[PDB]
Amino acid sequence: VKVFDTKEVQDLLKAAANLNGDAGNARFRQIVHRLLSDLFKAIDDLDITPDEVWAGVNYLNKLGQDGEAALLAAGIGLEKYLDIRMDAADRAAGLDGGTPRTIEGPLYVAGAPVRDGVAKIDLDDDADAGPLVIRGTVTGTDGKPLAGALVECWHANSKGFYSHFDPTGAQTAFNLRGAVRTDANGKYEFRTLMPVGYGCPPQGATQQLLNGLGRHGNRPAHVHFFVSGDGHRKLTTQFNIEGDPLIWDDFAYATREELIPHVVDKTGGAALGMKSDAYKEIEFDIVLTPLLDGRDNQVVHRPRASAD
Amino acid sequence: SVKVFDTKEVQDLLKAAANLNGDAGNARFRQIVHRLLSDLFKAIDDLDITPDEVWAGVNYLNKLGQDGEAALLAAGIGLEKYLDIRMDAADRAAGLDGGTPRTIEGPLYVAGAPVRDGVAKIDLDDDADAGPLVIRGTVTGTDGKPLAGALVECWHANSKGFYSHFDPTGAQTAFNLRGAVRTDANGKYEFRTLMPVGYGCPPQGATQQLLNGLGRHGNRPAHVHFFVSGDGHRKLTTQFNIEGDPLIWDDFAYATREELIPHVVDKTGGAALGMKSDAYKEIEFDIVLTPLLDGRDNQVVHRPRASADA
Ligand SMILES: [Ca+2]
Ligand SMILES: [Ca+2]
Ligand SMILES: [Ca+2]
Ligand SMILES: [Ca+2]
Ligand SMILES: [Ca+2]
Ligand SMILES: [Ca+2]
Ligand SMILES: [Ca+2]
Ligand SMILES: [Fe+3]
Ligand SMILES: [Fe+3]
């Protein structure tokens, strides 16, 4: 049957969203009515059965019980879609020359201590991960170095786990997470260990849905960044470790070709405090976009973990 | 505001995310996911829903599932009623619309209640504020013949609006106000119980949070739930509402139907029937079941349901 266009259904939708109610949150009612109407129309068009609907309802219970709604947002491409819309706005405004944005992901932790110029961020030993220096210069789109800019990074250990999200045992707070204020020449440096990619929690809601679709839930190795500075917008970006076999098959659709720097083999590591003489270096320069009339039209406020 | 939805980049992303071009798999599931994702992406584009708004919605889904309330929200935003609208439309087209009207199950059924022949007393815990209630009727098929050995199940709330197995103030006895009766040889069933009161959503929960955002209340008028089943017939999900409740036509879950508001009768002689006062109320609630079409029930619903041991 097809009932969506009937007066009874359209009246039910108006009542459910309270469109005819006292002055209230008009924007919220507008969004709820649109999403509910679309859901009801999809049920009608695809003849989605009650059994199917209740399985979807049960899935939402599991998704929130697992705390995975934001992981699903990444895995179904919603997070990338938000970036697509932000990129389209920037393109229409005539912006070019900044380091491309990519997705934040769900694993930022606020509160990492800020160091001047250089930070050593591997606090826990990890035998299987080799030493890695990440360094670069932050500039604006006019080419000038930005001094005192804040460069923040976070990444996984050799087992694919981040501090504050490790199910095998708590890591030291802020392991593999750091923040540096750039020096007078715009330079930042992190001394860390090499990340490995990772998958979704195998018994969790995100992987359950991916299994139903026939998709994997893995990401190639990467390092996340927030970069900010006076006069400039906040950049959310990352880079990927070159040569990872999943580099162009991220389940969260985050890879971009300008964000795959070369990895160089170096010596002299002990004098830098690294755990071996031989180490890898990645030079990742970053270009920030200026504010428009003092405003940042793309900074995102979302729930984020914190720690002391 | 940009419009990106109808670009190759977005359409390719949707196809990848739903794995439409993947190897042989669950085509139906992929089709549903692609449709829902596409509609969501299009709504974000059309209403210019900001990242901050999206992440607040994602956060809400986390809270909804942490609270275990997805099925309560399904009732509160009319989705559960909508499934009934579609089932009623299918019955009308098929000529299977001759039985007692259906209404929503709600999220509080519990499997495992004791079954009695003919008559069941289901108030296991005292409730000083609720008066005695007899519910009785006869189960027939659409041809009017009584159905012997049909299973009539009911469940309802206490005077505080709480159901056994879902009472946050303290555990009720297992299966308090929940029972099942096998009809007698003449189709009769009877429950002896106490009068229910209506109830609201958990005030700090996700469902009430969304309703508050819309400006809506989350209350239900007083009611009693039923499942009725029997060999050769479809399983009925229904309820009746207590006459005179001020919220009877303002249920937050949209479940009231004019055919399901029975006359309440004042009776005396309660002590002889094991009730706690001489005066009591009786509600007659007859049931007409539809015979199976082609030997299969195509409207029975499988969904997660609680269970317990008596
Ligand atoms: Ca330019
Ligand atoms: Ca250490
Ligand atoms: Ca460890
Ligand atoms: Ca549409
Ligand atoms: Ca008693
Ligand atoms: Ca009001
Ligand atoms: Ca007794
Ligand atoms: Fe990550
Ligand atoms: Fe109920």
The enclosing domain of A72 has a CATH number of 2.60.130.10
**A63–B61 CB contact, under 8 Å:** yes
DSSP B204: T
CA nearest A188: which of A262, A260, A119? A119
Two structure tokens written together for B75: 């009732």
A96 marked ligand binding residue? yes
CA B146, CA A48: separation in Å to the nearest integer? Answer: 35
The answer to whether A195 and A246 have CB atoms below 8 angstroms apart is no
The answer to whether B278 and B270 have CB atoms below 8 angstroms apart is yes
HEC assignment per residue over B98-150 = CCCCCCCCCCCCEECCCEEECEEECCCCCCCCCCEEEEEEEEEECCCCECCCC
Residue B298: its chain A contacts at CB < 8 A?
none
What is the longest distance spanned by two Cα atoms in chain B? 77
Q: Which parts of chain B fold into alpha helices (H)? A: 8-17, 27-46, 51-66, 70-76, 79-94, 206-214
Q: What is the CA radius of gyration of chain A?
A: 23
- Helix, strand, coil fractions of chain B, as percent rounded to 5: 25, 25, 50
**B35–A46 CB contact, under 8 Å:** yes
CA torsion, ordered B37, A29, A14, A76, to nearest 10 deg: 10
Cα–Cα–Cα angle for A290, A295, A298, nearest 5°? 80
Residues A32, A34, A36, A37, CA torsion sign: positive
Q: Who contacts B233 (Cβ-Cβ below 8 Å, separation ≥6)? A: B141, B147, B150, B289, B290, B291, B292
CA A260, CA B206: separation in Å to the nearest integer? Answer: 42
Q: List the determination method.
A: X-ray
CA nearest B179: which of B238, B121, B239? B121
What is the C-alpha end-to-end distance of chain A, expressed in Å? 57
A253 marked ligand binding residue? no
CA nearest B92: which of B290, B300, B226, B269? B290
- Write out the residue range of the structural domain in which residue A184 sits: 1-307
Write the burial class of residue A139 (CB in 10 Å: 0-12 exposed, 13-18 middle, 19+ buried): buried
Q: Who contacts B81 (Cβ-Cβ below 8 Å, separation ≥6)? A: A12, B75, B104, B253, B254, B255
3-state secondary structure of B253: coil
CA nearest A175: which of A193, A189, A150? A193
- Say what angle helices B79-94 and A50-65 make with each other, to 10 degrees: 170
Q: How far is B242 from chain A (nearest CA, A)?
A: 23
Residues B241, B247, B248, B250, CA torsion sign: negative
- Using the mean position of ligand 5's atoms as its centre, give its distance from the Cα of residue B308 in Å: 21
What is the longest distance spanned by two Cα atoms in chain A? 77
Two structure tokens written together for B78: 């009319």
Domain count for chain A: 1
CA separation, residue B103 to residues A30, A41, B194, B219, B230 (Å)? 28, 21, 22, 17, 18
The answer to whether B209 and B66 have CB atoms below 8 angstroms apart is no
- Using the mean position of ligand 8's atoms as its centre, give its distance from the Cα of residue A198 in Å: 8
**B52–A302 CB contact, under 8 Å:** yes
A222 marked ligand binding residue? yes
Residue A236: its chain B contacts at CB < 8 A?
none
State which amino acid sits at residue B162: F
CA separation, residue A95 to residues A79, A288, A296 (Å)? 21, 11, 13
Token pair 């160091």: residue:
A115
